[PDB]
Design a protein around this ligand. Structure first.
Ligand SMILES: *[C@@H]1O[C@H](CO)[C@@H](O)[C@H](O)[C@H]1NC(C)=O
Lengths: 48, 48, 48, 48
């Protein structure tokens, strides 16, 4: 739901959404790969 | 969970290689790790 | 206290006999609640 | 100590990071932790 949400709020607002009591894979985020720049800072998105 | 036989491991992503045992140490409930001086990971708690 | 959107509460439910003032004595205070909310607080008031 | 490096533990610099990161980071550890020995060694020699 975080990506496929409808409107995204303007910048001077925004929503910090807890995603918790759950399992989150990162492939479906990462390996979907239509993502212009997926730029990690600390982590290496394979390691996730 | 292999015990008292040298194993690699990962608990909740906190990794290392150790000889896992059972322990008299009594956590306070909220806690997760232990430590000792070196930034050791001394004790842990079976996550499941 | 509120640390960067979290919130903490510690406790003792502990006995005393004095009318006027604190028993002078030491007690540690282990957490009961931990809430990584994200609210801020500048002020407050109790209830009765 | 982090010696300026972005973490204390080697693995967590290993895991999290891309080698061209890890390399430049892992130096700071090494160069630091190395130099810590030469201090500790010299202290021995002088003391011993
Ligand atoms: C894992 O399952 C056991 C039931 O056998 C349960 O007691 C335990 O709470 C579960 N783990 C977690 C993290 O809830």
């Amino acid at each position: 739901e975080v990506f496929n949400a409808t409107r995204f709020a303007s910048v001077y607002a925004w929503n910090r959404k807890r995603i918790s009591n759950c399992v989150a894979d990162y492939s479906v985020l990462y390996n979907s790969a239509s993502f212009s720049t997926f730029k990690c800072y600390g982590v290496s998105p394979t390691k996730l | 969970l292999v015990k008292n036989k040298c194993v690699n491991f990962n608990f909740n992503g906190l990794t290392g290689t150790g000889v896992l045992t059972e322990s008299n140490k009594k956590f306070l409930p909220f806690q997760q790790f232990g430590r000792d001086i070196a930034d050791t990971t001394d004790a842990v708690r079976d996550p499941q | 206290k509120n640390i960067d959107g979290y919130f903490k509460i510690y406790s003792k439910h502990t006995p005393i006999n004095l009318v006027r003032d604190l028993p002078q004595g030491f007690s540690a205070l282990e957490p009961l609640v931990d809430l990584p909310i994200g609210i801020n607080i500048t002020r407050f008031q109790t209830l009765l | 100590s982090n010696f300026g490096a972005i973490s204390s533990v080697l693995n967590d610099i290993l895991s999290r990071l891309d080698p061209p990161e890890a390399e430049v980071q892992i130096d700071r550890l090494i160069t630091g932790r190395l130099q810590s020995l030469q201090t500790y060694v010299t202290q021995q020699l002088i003391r011993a």
